Design a protein around this ligand. Structure first.
Ligand SMILES: NC(=O)C1=CN([C@@H]2O[C@H](COP(=O)(O)OP(=O)(O)OC[C@H]3O[C@@H](n4cnc5c(N)ncnc54)[C@H](OP(=O)(O)O)[C@@H]3O)[C@@H](O)[C@H]2O)C=CC1
Ligand SMILES: CCc1nc(N)nc(N)c1-c1ccc(Cl)cc1
Ligand SMILES: [Co+2]
Length: 159
């Protein structure tokens, strides 16, 4: 099982300037719950976005995708292809934009947090991948985050 998990603005933006233009503690808890214990695969830029004092993310096999043969990610595995990372029973691809696009053919689940923030797409933004007709989607109710933004959770599945 390979799943993708991301939070997006309604526009599809997931990242800007190498970081994220919101922070929802409820989304962080959801992300932690879904990925805990499992493999997490991230692009090198997403690894770079984590403060050194917080990485590797606890309780998970942290894997970083990079073209750099000597790139060192202390506390993680660095691999040069996504296929190398898929050896565990449950694998979550945790971003960013480039790696979601690369992982989508292997994926059967997408766990999406939609953040009700009006954020037009700008050049250089990382975006959520486009899900074609093979994906079945299940939507939760809109909720209020303590950060003031509404959010809702989608669960997309396909065989
Ligand atoms: N809202 C959310 O849920 C999430 C948001 N984000 C945001 O997304 C943004 C980062 O996403 P993005 O900029 O797309 O960068 P990625 O995190 O997708 O990492 C890109 C890097 O992955 C490596 N890579 C890409 N393609 C390949 C390949 N074919 N083979 C080997 N290695 C490859 C390269 O590493 P190298 O250059 O070392 O070769 C490349 O620079 C940030 O803003 C981050 O905050 C991140 C995760 C989730
Ligand atoms: C809590 C933010 C978040 N929410 C969701 N729904 N998915 C994610 N993949 C992330 C995320 C973004 C960047 C990093 Cl470094 C780790 C996780
Ligand atoms: Co689990």
């Amino acid at each position: 099982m390979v799943g993708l998990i991301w939070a997006q603005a309604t526009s599809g933006v997931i990242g800007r300037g190498g970081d994220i233009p919101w922070r929802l503690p409820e989304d962080q808890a959801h992300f932690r719950e879904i990925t805990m214990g499992h493999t997490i695969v991230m692009g090198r830029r997403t690894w770079d976005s984590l403060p050194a004092k917080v990485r590797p993310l606890p309780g998970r096999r942290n894997v970083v995708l990079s073209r750099q043969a000597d790139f060192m990610a202390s506390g993680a595995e660095v691999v040069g292809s996504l296929e190398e990372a898929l050896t565990s029973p449950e694998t979550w691809v945790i971003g960013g934009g480039q790696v979601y696009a690369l992982a989508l053919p292997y994926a059967t689940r997408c766990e999406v947090t939609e953040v009700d923030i009006g954020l037009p797409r700008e050049a250089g933004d990382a975006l959520a991948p486009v899900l074609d007709e093979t994906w079945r989607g299940e939507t939760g109710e809109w909720r209020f985050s303590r950060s003031g933004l509404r959010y809702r959770l989608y669960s997309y599945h396909r065989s």
